[PDB]
């Protein structure tokens, strides 16, 4: 549905202007005007997710989802620019609900076994917790952090079908760098757990990147098989 | 009619450049070939809207107008520097023109439904109100200044069928700006009836300020609506 | 007769390739061409629309008087770009003698028991409304007012018998459209009306829009006796 | 015969690619194969017309011989950029066979009745004595300009048929077309009289000049007749 | 062939750059290169104007033939910082080739109908006729005052061309400058019969600036026009 | 089999592109991937030449073993910025099999009499002699040099089935150009025997630099056989 | 490899600029990161120089050796400033080696037909045998007499290369410049016979500067072949 993808991808355009119009100015007209464009973005874009989870257009959504991440960076944006409390818990909600539309994605392309959609999907779930991260350092709360903690070792868990998804059409594209994206989360998993100190930060920091180290054991082997 | 959009487009170009040639050297020969060029250039935008007008084309009308005030940009300079109270007279009335263009289109895209195109060329109208501004406080005459009186304030009317136009679509992207506008009139309203001292300036100026106030409360609700 | 209709349909392109050469140029003798071609267009199209309103063959006749609009179309940018008043006057009978074939087509089918055929038809008038509504703003004449007054309310009339097509069929289809068509007529008796302030034209409007309000309850039946 | 056509049509754009390495490089072993290709496109591209003179298809033939005269400007380029003398009298002789192949193709529509066909051709021979007018200019010479001037005015006897071709079916598309040419030629017997001097030219150039403002008449009427 | 271009305009910047090495150094093994690297620029410059003459592609002659009088520009300071006789006499045929070159030019845009391209054309031929004069100047001979006398009296002829060209299409744009350009002659005119004293160079003189106080006639109306 | 073709040239695009992942960053891990998918691309890259090979679709093939040779040059790149020796010697032995498939390649069109297809073929061939001519003057083996000199001398024995096939056609398109590669190769065997002094490839480059120059005189015939 | 371009040509800014930091300060720890800093330079910009030897980008290289000169111009002033007997031999290695990419270079496009591209680097070789000769008078040293003179007059074999690569395209550019380095040589055989006196070194003086006395005759027709 290319009508609703550029209309929707054009919202992106005009806010993202009307941000430097903004920080030219600092009119909260402006960005008032931002809170209500990019969120109803999220109600058409989501749309574009259902009716091309109808069909089976995997790469629709690819190119949808990943907008829908680029709100949460202007939403955030704003609320940095302005301070209020609940443009945070707008972005956070608009940010949590990313992960979901993300899972939502992944189980898509196994019944299609088109790998290397997913790929690109997971690693937009990834900076949703380096997104949430900087929000919790400006709160300080540990409310979103255990919102990142449960988002990212969840996002973990979904390489592993990946890897699954991959070992069935022996693919070793999508297969390596689902590896690499779980040391890209040990940085985060490290990060957090630096600061809160929870050894269970560090638990689930240790086993997630000593995952990795033996999740590459069942690559290690496709490189040798087609190469 | 994208060949007559660069030509047209192509002769500002000239013209403008020809400005720069005469800021060097003063030559009015150079200043009579701009009183030539952007003048028969109404002649052939205004086409560029006609048939553009037939076949439902609006984006092509918003690139268009908006060119047509860049000749009473170019066209005021000439005035300005010449000193010809006729090229006053000869803006003048291209500016005032531009009015009805400017009307002309904003009727059309209701039937298009694209509300959009609308509000950056109501803006158009907006800036001829403070073009015609600089044109009465040459002058000193208030001809002028009630024909910048009568645009604005029946341009103000149009924000309510923009207003109107958008809650048709519920869309907050013109909704929002549109009021905004309105404040951006009432500067003019002011700034003109703190010089004449018409206090039916400042009766429409007060109505005007007070509508906006008014306005936006329908706009509140549409905040609350999709977001 | 489909050699005629390729013939007449190829005529088109050329002289709408033509009008391209003379935006580029502007030389009239291209011009002159078109005032040739098109208007030669009418001869053959109106005797495709005979010859098939004999065999009973309706979409022929959909697909040609289509055309027909086509020129009306570019007869008017050439007066447009040239100026003349007559062309205007060319244009206008061509376009004033479309509604007579739009309605001699639309009794046609009533026989034949096919509304579907209709319908696009009917809005073909309704462009024709639109169209000398911009021909008449650019003279300015309130004949040509009243000939899009005379052609759209008798416009409006031949729903009626298209609603009446429908409710024998009981077919939705062309029925809720049916309806849509006086709103996307009001628009234009609205418009007209605005301008030439013409209560008549206000009381022709207002029992139009009104009529549409009390039609749809026609179909709001319809809506639930088949689904 | 589309085989040999897209064959032949083929051959071009890999010359004219190979002209542009040449273009970058300099090299004349590029060039030499220039000769070899497009002057066998000749040899094919006549056979084309041959087998399509025999049935009656016309418009694979003016697909064709347009194809021819962008070989002689492929060759022309090739001796302004080499500056072989002989390069010129190989694109000459091929320019002048051009000649007769459209000659050839003139008088095959009238047995059709096609005369949409002969104009588009009839135009490629008008090219060539610009084509030669160029070869003229560098050589110097009076022959090519003879044969230029001999080619032309042959050309010009050839409208004729066409305005006369027309008259039997009446048609005004070709008709008004087929005087301008010779407007569009009367540029060239001015150009080459400009420079030769010779009051012949100046003869054949005033009543070529002279016919079209007579042929014109006749088709002032046709102008009356249909429209 | 922008290959070809780019490659002229590439030899301008580096013996252009190569007289800046000399200026600092003062080596003539600097300046023999220059008198090859720009001499055969016109080779080859000569031949884009060749190969664009047939196509009809003028914009890119216009950007080719200023090219070569900036070679003018380049070896005339040669001759000037070396004194030697034949560098004169080279840049002086060089320079005299470039008015047919623009003579060249002027009568292939009619053909095209595309005035703008002559008129900065036109000015080119100009600077060369200031361009002899300061070479007469040097070598104080009648010979290339001369040359330059019939340079620029027949470049003052080509406006006629001009100013008919622009009358068919009506466009004022090119049709006032050309009337300045022949005041911008009249200085010439003037200069050089202040000099030689010869009272033809001034009846030259008179005749040509009485001929754009009559010129400009035939433009007052066309002020009328259009505008 | 173009969903084969465009999911093989997919894989080219996205290695190509994590290649410059690995130049602003430098890891390995980017690199290994590169390994994997390129030498993954030579297992469905070949089978797209064996599947393509059946029904005769030769430009299927050089289309394909173009996109082998694109490969080629990117393991190269990688064993540049890695040093690894194996790297080379995948690269090698990768490369070295694209000789076999090009030569598989050229026997294909004789029975299907098409030659072109060929001589962009064998180009590629050349290549590869001078792309692990590279790869030689780095390890400074004679193994490699060796391997190049087998290739392209062998490579050089093919032109003569290729000039034997066009002579069959009497076609001189890739008559001559088939010359020109043998001095295009001549280069080559100049510079691997200016460097190792083995004056068998001083032998080995005289008969092949000699051939050229006998072999053209079959083709000096064929430029006066149809031209 | 633009990314690899800017990166290297980032390193010598910094570099360069803690260069001027020591001659502030005079700390060898700023002194020994140059020599890790631009050592690592060599790594990285001979990588450049493969890639780009690969695809045949030959720009890039003479952007790229050009650098590692400029390293060799730094890690000599390292040398002076701290008088480390190993820094020369450093230096020496990477000064020596610049000789083989430069050689590298030059055989490269002639197989591209570029010669400008060579003629800028050969002269960065004429630099450094300048180069070595003020290092050779700082160790007083023989053996880099010698590295010096087998440099050169190998140098100067290459010309006659670039001068057998001009006479194939005629190009009079890189003719005459060619000629002129061996002069611009003849003060290095000169210098360095003066001092050591070995007759050996004056004979190979002799014979290079009677060289380009022969060889500037090829040129000599050369500049009156095209000038």
Known sequence: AEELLK???????????????????????????????????????????????????????????????????????????????????????????????????????ESQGDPEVALRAVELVVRVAELLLLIAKVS????????????????????????????KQGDPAVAILAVMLVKRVAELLENIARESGSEEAKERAERVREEARELQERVKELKERAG
Chains 1, 2, 3, 4, 5, 6, 7 share one sequence.
């Open 7 to 109: 209309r929707v991808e054009k919202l992106v355009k005009e806010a993202e202007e009307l941000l430097r119009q903004a920080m030219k100015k600092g009119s909260e007209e402006l960005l008032e005007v931002a809170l209500v464009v990019a969120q109803m973005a999220a109600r058409e874009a989501k749309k574009v997710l259902t009716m091309a989870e109808v069909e089976g257009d995997p790469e629709v959504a690819l190119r949808a989802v990943e907008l829908v991440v680029r709100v949460a960076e202007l939403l955030l944006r704003i609320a940095l620019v302005s301070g209020s409390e609940e443009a945070l818990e707008r972005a956070l909600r608009v940010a949590e609900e990313a992960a979901r539309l993300a899972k939502r994605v992944l189980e898509l392309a």
């Open 140 to 167: 300080g709360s540990e409310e979103a952090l255990e919102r990142a903690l449960r988002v990212a070792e969840e996002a973990a868990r979904l390489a592993k079908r990946v890897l699954e998804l991959a070992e």
